[PDB]
Design an enzyme around this catalytic site. Structure first.
Site, PDB file in Angstrom:
ATOM      1  N   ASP A 162      53.611 -36.829 -38.176  1.00  0.00           N
ATOM      2  CA  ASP A 162      54.698 -35.966 -37.713  1.00  0.00           C
ATOM      3  C   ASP A 162      54.864 -34.713 -38.555  1.00  0.00           C
ATOM      4  O   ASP A 162      55.523 -33.757 -38.135  1.00  0.00           O
ATOM      5  CB  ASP A 162      56.016 -36.743 -37.627  1.00  0.00           C
ATOM      6  CG  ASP A 162      55.962 -37.842 -36.576  1.00  0.00           C
ATOM      7  OD1 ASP A 162      55.632 -37.542 -35.401  1.00  0.00           O
ATOM      8  OD2 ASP A 162      56.205 -39.010 -36.938  1.00  0.00           O
ATOM      9  N   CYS A 166      59.114 -45.342 -41.224  1.00  0.00           N
ATOM     10  CA  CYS A 166      58.517 -44.474 -40.203  1.00  0.00           C
ATOM     11  C   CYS A 166      57.004 -44.695 -40.108  1.00  0.00           C
ATOM     12  O   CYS A 166      56.382 -45.177 -41.055  1.00  0.00           O
ATOM     13  CB  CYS A 166      58.820 -43.007 -40.501  1.00  0.00           C
ATOM     14  SG  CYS A 166      57.649 -41.854 -39.754  1.00  0.00           S
ATOM     15  N   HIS A 167      56.400 -44.318 -38.983  1.00  0.00           N
ATOM     16  CA  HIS A 167      54.978 -44.608 -38.787  1.00  0.00           C
ATOM     17  C   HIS A 167      54.004 -43.431 -38.697  1.00  0.00           C
ATOM     18  O   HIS A 167      52.839 -43.615 -38.312  1.00  0.00           O
ATOM     19  CB  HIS A 167      54.793 -45.552 -37.609  1.00  0.00           C
ATOM     20  CG  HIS A 167      54.999 -46.980 -37.978  1.00  0.00           C
ATOM     21  ND1 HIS A 167      53.965 -47.792 -38.389  1.00  0.00           N
ATOM     22  CD2 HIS A 167      56.128 -47.728 -38.058  1.00  0.00           C
ATOM     23  CE1 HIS A 167      54.443 -48.989 -38.677  1.00  0.00           C
ATOM     24  NE2 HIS A 167      55.753 -48.978 -38.489  1.00  0.00           N
ATOM     25  N   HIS A 179      58.242 -37.787 -42.289  1.00  0.00           N
ATOM     26  CA  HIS A 179      57.730 -36.734 -41.415  1.00  0.00           C
ATOM     27  C   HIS A 179      57.296 -35.518 -42.225  1.00  0.00           C
ATOM     28  O   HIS A 179      57.365 -34.383 -41.751  1.00  0.00           O
ATOM     29  CB  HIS A 179      58.793 -36.292 -40.409  1.00  0.00           C
ATOM     30  CG  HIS A 179      59.217 -37.362 -39.462  1.00  0.00           C
ATOM     31  ND1 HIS A 179      60.327 -37.244 -38.655  1.00  0.00           N
ATOM     32  CD2 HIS A 179      58.676 -38.577 -39.182  1.00  0.00           C
ATOM     33  CE1 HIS A 179      60.462 -38.339 -37.926  1.00  0.00           C
ATOM     34  NE2 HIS A 179      59.472 -39.158 -38.229  1.00  0.00           N
ATOM     35  N   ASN A 202      66.785 -42.420 -36.668  1.00  0.00           N
ATOM     36  CA  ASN A 202      66.784 -41.095 -37.289  1.00  0.00           C
ATOM     37  C   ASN A 202      68.157 -40.465 -37.419  1.00  0.00           C
ATOM     38  O   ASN A 202      69.063 -40.788 -36.665  1.00  0.00           O
ATOM     39  CB  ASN A 202      65.887 -40.150 -36.491  1.00  0.00           C
ATOM     40  CG  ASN A 202      64.422 -40.374 -36.774  1.00  0.00           C
ATOM     41  OD1 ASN A 202      64.042 -40.661 -37.903  1.00  0.00           O
ATOM     42  ND2 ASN A 202      63.591 -40.226 -35.755  1.00  0.00           N
TER      43      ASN A 202
HETATM   44 MN   LIG Z   1      59.165 -41.186 -37.709  1.00  0.00          MN
END
Ligand SMILES: [Mn+2]
Ligand SMILES: [Mn+2]
Lengths: 468, 469
Positions: B267, B181-182, B210, B160
């Site tokens: 997120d 990203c997950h 996010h 990040n």
């Molecule tokens: Mn992430």
């Protein structure tokens, strides 16, 4: 031709419009009919009598009419100037007095200069309870009437919020609306202060309403910004404002110049971040003496002056009515000049459109590519050349700086979208969401309470029901 | 093929990557070379020994190599997974610890959860002093090296800020970066709570890293949002989080759903306005018991937990160095599974590009028209189909709501541009301007002082001088 002034109760302004028309050769003819309209019978009358008297003393053939019917003012008009500022006479003396009352409520809930004062949006009486319901509603109504009763007219929007309204009308009605503001005149302060003859400077400004920037500034065939830098090095320290309105060369203006790379112009200087505006003492640091014009001392003071000036004009109307021998062009030269146009853009625009008197103006019209990285349909404040073939966007060059786009214009554009959404959705959650983005907000409970109290004021009944 | 893991000192994640590779049939080959690189010798060593130990216990022909050289990691790589979290070991035990310290300086100056916590940007350890100099600098360096010494490789950015870094690398070097990203996985949480089979749901998410929204949610041939409404009416009031990370069905997420018209996913829920985040008590109202994970209580506690887990793996590495008969797949099945992929996107991506195993992923890539009203070149988080022909953007349908665009995504995009400008401009005034837009700023003098102290910290000397003329 038929030129209609809606909100002619705004006496001084209506008069300066008439004066400009009567002093303009191509327009000063028998078939130029000026329609004066307002719901306030006495203010309308004062404008009417002083207008007819003025044209008589000027010996102008122009015809002046008054009416209380919006429909009559609009029917078959060629140009409609919207300068109305709606308010409830049961509660207030004028729109600005209603704004002042709401601002005080905001202040007691911890919003200095009211919830309508926001970052990049400090200009007083610009928006009202964020979505400017009365002003947007009226403009939309005018626009729809104009589409049927005056299909060829231009709606010249002068009442605020100019940006939101012009954009709203364009998007939701498709009406022929053009927004008018004259903050561009700040550029003459800059030229003077630097010792430059206005007619020897090659300049341009561009941006958004009360959000324009001196993108081009050239003198003797070269960039003239180094000249501003010199002035900052030598004169800024000792700069003093000639009055509360005088901000163009202020420390705030130059601090914005340092950050953005170009000088903010006119009302743009008023519309800065909270850096310059946290409280009155901060305003005095950045604008010196008066703390500018958008503060708790100067603004109410300005509105009171306005009210008095208006009441003097109404009295003067009475005088001329009893003594038809009175000569106002001699008695009051400043209010009724004979060799001086106001400098306002309204009448030149009309002369340009109707009579092919080609002129450069700065108006709120759809971008259509003038500024890169903005949508074609976004209303922006652009340099345009106007003549009888219409409105032609001047090539903007140099381009606005990257910082101006990402830090100033785009955030301002998003706020316009937020305010428009707050109007059209009828959703109180949008009003709340706007205040949640407000740096002065400390808790959600605060947001709910300030809006509860503002929306419960008796003169906001219609607005309260709208959001219910 | 050569797969390089930069920042392999992040032991557990690097192992998870190795494990997925070894359990992937098309990648388990003797010409698959996994380079682990990191400047931290002990941690790199631990990843290295546990990795080789796992591929043996699985009988994989995969070659594992370790190096402290960035240049060696990159040279001739086919895939480079940047999971590095740069930190000065003279001062800190990890990047997180450094972030924690700076956050405390900010709080001392009146910025709750640090200057790096901003509206729509609450995710902990996402940016570092706004411009994320150490992380952006590294990614750019890798990008330029890659264009020269690995001209065909993919840079798979995991560290990040993914949005800022992906965008910066794309714009300033044009290198072949994709951001990973997950967050999207919060969607299964939604399916489980609603009692729906994940395989019989027709769904899509889209937005920004996010910052993704459940734009399509259909079940048995019908819009399934009515089912969510049903759940909200019946279950929300009694909803309780299972751990500090459990926020997908929180009152915060639902309050956002009600305003925006679509559910924030993953997120995105942590990345709300200050409405949900003013203080710990406010966080507890909107996220219940723990106050979520981004607070002065749970975040240090999570960071210590991570440190503890890392140290256990290092000690285990030692155990294996001194007992080659230990079967770590037996001792700790949870950490060293067989026949079970992590569910992460990185290795399926590699298998798709390298071996045409086609798969739908959610990656940060240039918009290129997928989302209307956003620039072609803007990096966004999009549903994409991946195979050996590359990245194919799925049609996004239904469109994201107007409110999501004007109130959420665009404000988020502008902040990315602010953060990027704060980096390349080398100009402290831009760091200042960002804090001037921050609600918890009460005066300019406050802004000057918090940045002065943070920039004067011994471990911020490089950044301090970078911002000096
Ligand atoms: Mn992430
Ligand atoms: Mn104006």
């Amino acid at each position: 031709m038929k030129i209609s002034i809606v909100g002619a109760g705004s006496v001084r302004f209506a008069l300066q419009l008439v004066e400009d028309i009567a002093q303009t050769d191509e327009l000063s003819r028998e078939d130029t009919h000026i329609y004066l309209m307002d719901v306030h019978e006495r203010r309308l009358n004062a404008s009417y009598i002083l207008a007819r008297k003025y044209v008589e003393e000027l010996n102008s053939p122009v015809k002046v009419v008054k009416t209380e019917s919006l429909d009559e003012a609009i029917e078959g008009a060629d140009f409609i100037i919207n300068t109305a500022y709606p308010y409830d006479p049961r509660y207030h003396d004028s729109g600005s007095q209603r704004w002042d009352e709401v601002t005080k409520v905001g202040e007691k809930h911890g919003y200095y200069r009211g919830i309508d004062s926001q970052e990049l949006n400090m200009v007083s009486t610009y928006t009202y309870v964020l979505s400017s319901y009365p002003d947007v509603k009226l403009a939309l109504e005018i626009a729809e009437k104009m589409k049927k009763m005056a299909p060829k007219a231009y709606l010249m929007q002068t009442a605020n919020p100019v940006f939101e309204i012009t954009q709203a009308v364009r998007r939701w009605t498709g009406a022929n609306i053009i927004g008018f503001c004259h903050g561009v005149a700040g550029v003459y302060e800059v030229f003077e202060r630097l010792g430059l003859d206005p007619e020897e400077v090659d300049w341009q400004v561009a941006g958004v309403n009360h959000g324009i920037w001196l993108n081009r500034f050239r003198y003797r065939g070269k960039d003239a910004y180094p000249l501003l830098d010199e002035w900052i090095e030598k004169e800024l320290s000792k700069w003093e404002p000639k009055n509360p309105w005088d901000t163009q060369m202020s420390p705030a203006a130059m601090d914005m110049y340092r950050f953005y790379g170009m000088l903010p112009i006119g009302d743009t200087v008023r519309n800065g971040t909270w850096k310059y505006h946290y409280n009155l003492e901060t305003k005095k640091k950045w604008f010196r003496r008066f703390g500018g014009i958008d503060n708790e001392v100067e603004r109410p003071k300005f509105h009171e002056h306005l009210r008095r000036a208006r009441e003097r004009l109404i009295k003067l109307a009475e005088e001329v009515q009893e003594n038809p021998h009175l000569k106002i062009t001699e008695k009051h030269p400043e209010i009724f000049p004979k060799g001086r146009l106001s400098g306002e853009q309204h009448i030149p625009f009309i002369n340009a459109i109707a009579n092919n008197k080609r002129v450069r103006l700065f108006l709120n019209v759809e971008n259509q590519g003038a500024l890169k990285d903005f949508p074609d349909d976004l209303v922006m404040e652009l340099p345009v050349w106007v003549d009888s073939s219409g409105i032609h966007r001047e090539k903007v060059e140099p381009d606005l700086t990257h910082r101006i786009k990402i830090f100033y214009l785009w955030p301002r554009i998003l706020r316009t979208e937020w305010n428009l959404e707050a109007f059209i959705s009828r959703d109180r959650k949008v009003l709340e969401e706007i205040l949640i983005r407000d740096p002065r907000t400390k808790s959600y409970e605060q947001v709910v309470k300030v809006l509860d109290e503002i929306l419960s004021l008796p003169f906001n009944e219609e607005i309260r029901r709208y959001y219910e």
